[PDB]
A paper describes a structure:
Here cryo-electron microscopy analyses of human CE pre-B complex and B-like complexes reveal extensive structural similarities with their CI counterparts. The results indicate that the CE and CI spliceosome assembly pathways converge already at the pre-B stage. The molecular triggers and roles of B-specific proteins in these rearrangements are also identified.
To that end, we determined cryo-EM structures of complexes formed after the addition of an excess of 5′ss oligo to affinity-purified CE pre-B dimers in the absence or presence of ATP or ATPγS. ATPγS was previously shown to support the formation of human B complexes but prevents their subsequent transformation into activated B (Bact) complexes and/or their dissociation. The cryo-EM structures of the protomers of affinity-purified CE pre-B dimers incubated with 5′ss oligo (designated pre-B5′ss) or with 5′ss oligo plus ATPγS (designated pre-B5′ss+ATPγS) were determined at 4.2 Å and 3.1 Å, resolution, respectively, at their tri-snRNP cores. A single 5′ss oligo is also bound in pre-B5′ss+ATPγS complexes. Notably, the addition of ATPγS or ATP to pre-B5′ss complexes leads to repositioning of the BRR2 helicase domain and to substantial restructuring of other tri-snRNP components. These include PRP31, PRP6 and PRP8RH, which are also repositioned in B-like complexes. In pre-B5′ss+ATPγS, BRR2 and the tightly bound PRP8 Jab1/MPN domain (PRP8Jab1) undergo a large-scale translocation. BRR2–PRP8Jab1 is now anchored to its new position at the tip of PRP8En through the PRP8RH–PRP8Jab1 linker, the ends of which are stably bound to PRP8En at the same position as in the B-like complex. Furthermore, in contrast to the situation in the B-like complex, in pre-B5′ss+ATPγS, BRR2NC is in an inactive conformation, in which the separator loop tightly interacts with the Sec63 domain, thereby blocking access of the U4 snRNA to the RNA-binding region of the BRR2NC RecA domains. The U4 snRNA quasi-pseudoknot is dissolved in pre-B5′ss+ATPγS, accompanied by displacement of RBM42 and SNRNP27K, but U4/U6 stem III is still present and, together with the U4 Sm core, adopts a new position.
Residue numbers in the entry:
A (entry chain A): 245 to 438
B (entry chain G): 241 to 255, 270 to 308
C (entry chain C): 116 to 951
D (entry chain U): 100 to 555
E (entry chain B): 36 to 57
F (entry chain A): 974 to 1314
G (entry chain A): 585 to 633
The structure:
Amino acid sequence: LLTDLVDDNYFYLFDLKAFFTSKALNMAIPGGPKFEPLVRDINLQDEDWNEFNDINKIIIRQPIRTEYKIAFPYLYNNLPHHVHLTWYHTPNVVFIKTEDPDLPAFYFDPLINPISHRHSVKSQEPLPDDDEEFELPEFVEPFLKDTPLYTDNTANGIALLWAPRPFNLRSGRTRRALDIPLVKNWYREHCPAG
Amino acid sequence: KDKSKELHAIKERYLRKFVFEWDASEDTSIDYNPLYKERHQVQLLGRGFIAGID
Amino acid sequence: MDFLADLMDNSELIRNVTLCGHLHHGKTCFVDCLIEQTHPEIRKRYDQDLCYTDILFTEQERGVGIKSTPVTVVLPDTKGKSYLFNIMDTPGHVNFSDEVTAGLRISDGVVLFIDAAEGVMLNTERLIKHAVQERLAVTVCINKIDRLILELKLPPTDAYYKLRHIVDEVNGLISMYSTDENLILSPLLGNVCFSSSQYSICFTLGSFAKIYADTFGDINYQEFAKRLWGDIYFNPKTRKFTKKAPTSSSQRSFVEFILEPLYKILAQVVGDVDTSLPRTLDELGIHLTKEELKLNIRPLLRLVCKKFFGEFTGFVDMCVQHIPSPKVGAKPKIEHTYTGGVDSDLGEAMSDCDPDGPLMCHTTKMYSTDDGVQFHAFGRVLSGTIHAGQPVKVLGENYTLEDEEDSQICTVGRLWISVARYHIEVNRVPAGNWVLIEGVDQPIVKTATITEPRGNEEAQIFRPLKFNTTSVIKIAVEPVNPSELPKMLDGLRKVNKSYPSLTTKVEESGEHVILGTGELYLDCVMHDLRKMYSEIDIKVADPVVTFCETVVETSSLKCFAETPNKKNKITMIAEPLEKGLAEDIENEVVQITWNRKKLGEFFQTKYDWDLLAARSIWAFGPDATGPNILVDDTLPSEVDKALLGSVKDSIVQGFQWGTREGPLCDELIRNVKFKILDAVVAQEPLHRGGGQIIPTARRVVYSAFLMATPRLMEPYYFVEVQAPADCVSAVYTVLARRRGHVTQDAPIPGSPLYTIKAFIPAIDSFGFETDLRTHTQGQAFSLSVFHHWQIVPGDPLDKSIVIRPLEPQPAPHLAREFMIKTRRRKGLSEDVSISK
Amino acid sequence: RRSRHCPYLDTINRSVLDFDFEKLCSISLSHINAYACLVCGKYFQGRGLKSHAYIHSVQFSHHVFLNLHTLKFYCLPDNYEIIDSSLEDITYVLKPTFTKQQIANLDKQAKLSRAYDGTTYLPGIVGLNNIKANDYANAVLQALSNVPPLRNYFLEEDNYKNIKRPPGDIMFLLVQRFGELMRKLWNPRNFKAHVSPHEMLQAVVLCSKKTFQITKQGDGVDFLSWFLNALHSALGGTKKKKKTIVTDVFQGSMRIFTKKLPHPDLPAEEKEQLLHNDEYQETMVESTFMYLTLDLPTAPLYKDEKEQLIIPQVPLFNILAKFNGITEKEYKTYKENFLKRFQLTKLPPYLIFCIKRFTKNNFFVEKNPTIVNFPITNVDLREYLSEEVQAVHKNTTYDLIANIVHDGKPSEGSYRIHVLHHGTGKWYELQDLQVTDILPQMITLSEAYIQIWKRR
Amino acid sequence: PTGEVLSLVGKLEGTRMGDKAQ
Amino acid sequence: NVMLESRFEKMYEKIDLTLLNRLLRLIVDHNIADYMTAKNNVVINYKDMNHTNSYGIIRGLQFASFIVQYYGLVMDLLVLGLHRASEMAGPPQMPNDFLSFQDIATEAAHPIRLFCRYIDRIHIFFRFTADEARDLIQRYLTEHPDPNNENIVGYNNKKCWPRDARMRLMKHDVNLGRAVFWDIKNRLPRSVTTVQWENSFVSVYSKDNPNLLFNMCGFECRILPKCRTSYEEFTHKDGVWNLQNEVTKERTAQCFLRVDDESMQRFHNRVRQILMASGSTTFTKIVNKWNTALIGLMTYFREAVVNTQELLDLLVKCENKIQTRIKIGLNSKMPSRFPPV
Amino acid sequence: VGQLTGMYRYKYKLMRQIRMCKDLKHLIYYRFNTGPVGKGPGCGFWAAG
């Protein structure tokens, strides 16, 4: 019942703010809904052939889509009233979920492109004369040496961070069965192809 | 056909009974752009799947 | 509070730093962490971020930094030395690179924020190059360390490998721009800091070694930090650091002592809250109440990293050590910025950063108020102090010592020390500080110098602000109601004051064009114009790019023009420039102010121009560094050189004006070399007046440029996209659809994402970001920056080509069309009048 | 020394030289270093190499330019200063400075001044060019420009310069531009016969916060009240002064006896005990006014028995039956009625009468067309002053010097102004550009709305 | 079959107005 | 080519009786003129209200039309001028046609080339050379300067046509339209008559504007010449007049007809007052009134109906309203499958 | 509910719910009858309606 979406970059122009913008601007995202115009303005909808909006002066390379007038509402159409600005870009949350429990929680998954530390240029950095002057006291150890690097719940605990809203919480408040839309995120996302 | 769809879009931009069913004319997901028709579905690193679908 | 004010008097205890980096790399979140550390009552909500510097309504809605924000706060050091830090939180978006420069000129240090997962990106490279150009100290902070743990789940050795690759790539980038070897970076040098501002982690090698020394004692944290990075290993048999691995699988010192404890604490907090977290917190000495263990994983992790790491002292010590104070850092700033140079007496006085010297501010920013009717200038004081309610002399970008016209006397009202959300009113601001000056907005447009009146009359201006990239996107803006035309103009003025790279110009036809860098930049500009400055309805034309004009062939015939006095004749020819020479002029590689003996030697060496011919160079065409060169080639025995030199200046102005206003579509001219082949100057001094020579010089320039084969030049943007490896083909398809070609597609080392670098037409880049993000369903993201002018295909003077309105023309029909409509947009004639 | 020998003095055309526009560059929209091209009259970025003024000089072949702020002329193709006596008038057009000797001689002027276009005109009586149908502001500004003491105060800059201002106080912009327009109106050597208030209207709109816009036409009374209140604030330091140029000229002192009328649906004994309870008794409250508001009688609403459709008229003294102890006005409120009889205390040297028209009834706004029957030569307000202050004010005679009249229905109406030439004693009306010589007798046969009186 | 007069905007537009007239 | 369609705003209500009497004595016997002007001055009565009409003319008089057709004629002499009026009317012994001239030189010797006054709606067609148009524009702007380019605000346009087929409000074209209207308005004294810009339409055809728009006798007309912007000279569309040149006998222009919005509104209001005043009325009378109105409209326009796609919907809606009225008369509950027989 | 009860005849605004309940079905059924399971009267995800 949960889509494995890690960030809301999927909802680029398909979120609530974009739909508010489309309703206010009388257009509609292809996958989005259609609305009655917020203000009729039929007389002003069809403006005259001004010297400013003169098509003979307009260079056409790629037609201005409805999405363009929603992505940058204040730049692409006149009279952008009651319009909303959508979140530009959440950083791509590069989360790599484990596929086998029988594998270390901290693992260099093949999905990662290899780092391939190059030795073409010998990396030179100021490092003192080795093993001659500085010595650690016998009571000095790494902070958590007894603690293991990962337990059995480390992978599942990390995968809980990148989980839908009800499942990324440790605690919370009890809701009513009415107030829990199980299929709300099914139509909030894009319709499956075919 | 689809080549004239782009030009038509440019021109258009610049120049009793109970119905339980929803009319197919109400559909908005109609596009002339091949980019906006055959969108690239999220692969989710080959390890994520859309909800509901088996 | 009062200690903050009393700390400004000592110029040695002040650090002027700017936090610059790629888009969404944690600079704003890092400043939020610093503010929370300094302000006990300011804490972020568990779900929402703080975004203290994101004060604009646009920023809190777009989620992207729009404008640079000043934050003046007192931060303790590792030892506890409370330094005063003036942080300029700059936007990470490339389109707002100018907003960085406004904060980069008044900063003595640069903090390059780099995402650990993403690494070095486009804006990161641009910012390090630009900061090296202004000769600023560069220190690096790798933010979002948790993305190597909680997202990639890399092994600690591989996390160290990713960090080392990130640090070593910046070293290989600075070497391409900085000759000085001191600009090298290494966390053991103190140059490089590690952080995760989401969970309030901030440590350098020195800071983490200090934590170790506080836990166990009898440890030199400096010496310990000297051996906490690189191929150095730790042997517990001898308790000593050895360059060779004591065992078969001995982890490095950084992995064993730094990355291992951080990995384990994060793993315990995110996976074992109920089982092992209290035990490991007792082991680490952290005590969390019963209610503090009831919080969700992310707030609990942030709290436990706040307790373990404490203050952000690693950032403070890095900035203190490797970023010069205004007292010591003034001399390179004065040399690179002051027009009179350091040799000037005023320059020498300003090099000492004396609080008792003559007043010399340098305003680079202009911040609007709540109502938008008054602007507060913002600038760095370089010498003397500025007092509230004090008459001062405010210069301008066009002011010279000979011309007191551009300087207006204005009274400084209240002065504020600005820290993000709030401002503390002060009476005086000593030198080396940042100040919000009120009452000097009227003479200031973009950048000005504030000094004292009736004294220090020999005071030139600081150099005009130099921007990383050229603004080529152009949008025409009219009022919906023409009766409200002045208000728009008023609003236009305001946006011109508020955006450093904005260019508002009224055309011949009466269209007011605004110049911006990209779609988001112009969207924000129009939002500001409509919502807070003009408050009127506004009509915006379809975005278009600016074009240039070039030649590809030598002019067929010698083009002559004679003055209306019918006594002066100029015969000129036009030739295209060599590859890279125009870029060399633009990059200020060579200046017309160079000594003439070596100026000719440059063209004789890199381009093999004749020494006598190279010495005949007159000027850099339209701009001091403009990409057009005017070269004399008159026969010495046919034209009197002494007499020709009399009208040399007038010919120079005519050349500059003609190159600035092209004949094709009234645009710039690029990559053209005009050779003067014949001069016939009237022997009488008053018959060779500039008022006749300059129009004639422009006319002959136009004729020669037209006879040489004209070509239109369009800007090409350089676009890098970071997308999942599956989405590379979709990016290729989109770019091929929008006339763009991919130059490279390289995987990001240490992340599955691939970076695709391509070149796209700027006029074809409108909606390219939206097309890419929508087609890839948000997985691919693009940042576009202007890269270079390129010849558009087709003959621009082909009269036979017919243009169909509302159709995207083919490639050979582009160059013609791009002219004609542009001419129609300028109010010019239908075709190019060659006979004119 | 190539100055003082320019060959382009004949190139200047004073006809197109209109300085009433905003001093901003026509290309860069920059208000700094504004330079006007005297050949074409268009402002540019400023004198200097690679500047818009230089470009225009080398493009249009226009050589002589005038610096808007420095008031100095330059040749841009060679960029050298120009000094010539014949140019002084041009500067005097841009910045008309009046000496103290000339300021006091403006009220004794009886000569028809000559302009550059030959259209003879009287100083002060100059048509204000309508911009976007806002003739109410033009009428109010003309009426205030006709005031001698206010004019003399505003003719000299140092009267209202070097005063301390609050940092965020844009109110100065209203008073520093009113002086400019007023000295443009009274300049007797204008290039054009009229004056464009387009420069001041911007300050009026900006200071009023979008009300009294240029496009719309507001009420003259409301605009006059706002302007008089704003000028009072615009003068003085951070704290307003008790005696500004508006208080001592227009402000007078009036006394009000506010008695609360009991509700009619009460017992007579209960009524008298409520009156005794001090809740329904007179309360003398002094106050100050910038103008006296005069209520008009209601329209007859019916034809007369003999002369059907007779225009309603009322003598001025019947309108001025207000402001005395004898008469009362039952002011009705949705809560309760009040009995407020007024009593003048101090008559200002210049008394403004605002006749109440454009009254909003229960459904819309209607104008009372009653004709005010007033004399234009001599009156006496001694009967309208209390006995205590009658000795203090030895003068109670006022002469009409300015009159506003509204023609047309309140939905769309024009504002004409009749101004009395103080020097000659003649009356001239000016509706925007139009100026005519109406006989003084025909002044009183108009639907007066705002009047200005001088006590001499 | 409803008998409602339907608009002929786009309906019966093939034929001219001179048809069926003499 | 600039065409100005307008109307004298209140000619009927502003015909001075003394001046009208003098002008009538000019053309008719003084006894007849005195009788007519005295008949125009009588007591207007309605219920309890009555007054005397001493300023305007009474249009209920049988000869009033003549008076109008005379008074408007005077306005023509004020608009065209005696010279151009004589050129249009031709020599008194060889009167010209409705739209014709004795010689081509007389046709081309004045800006005003066509004129028709109708009753109160004057249509004027000027042809302007570039120099003449520029001179008129400068003369108009001398007393009406427009620094803000505000001439486009109040410029009326025929919104029933699409943006490309409408008149294009270019700066020079709008300036010329304003100049022409101001020139025409200056000729007529403001007291004898007046022309109002809001209740008037000026359409100019130039390089910028390819379509010549106007409205006359309820017809929204647009001429698009074949020379410039005629991709195909289609003939199948029956709502399009195919203009022809009488000299070359060749296809030169193309006229598109359309029903004016005012005519559609008038028909809709007529149907409304047919329907609402049909309470205690026979079905036959209602259908007869509907048939009379419909046949009047359809036989008046006969071509402008097909292009006015809104008129078709209006007509079918009105027919449905009438049929619903009849059905409700037959039975309160509406039928489901009422037949058309 | 419209077919079972026909309560839309006494409240037309109720149709808004009815059209929604069908819509949710199209959302659920085509997520349900996707794999080897085909169309049929077996889906029982009744929470939404």
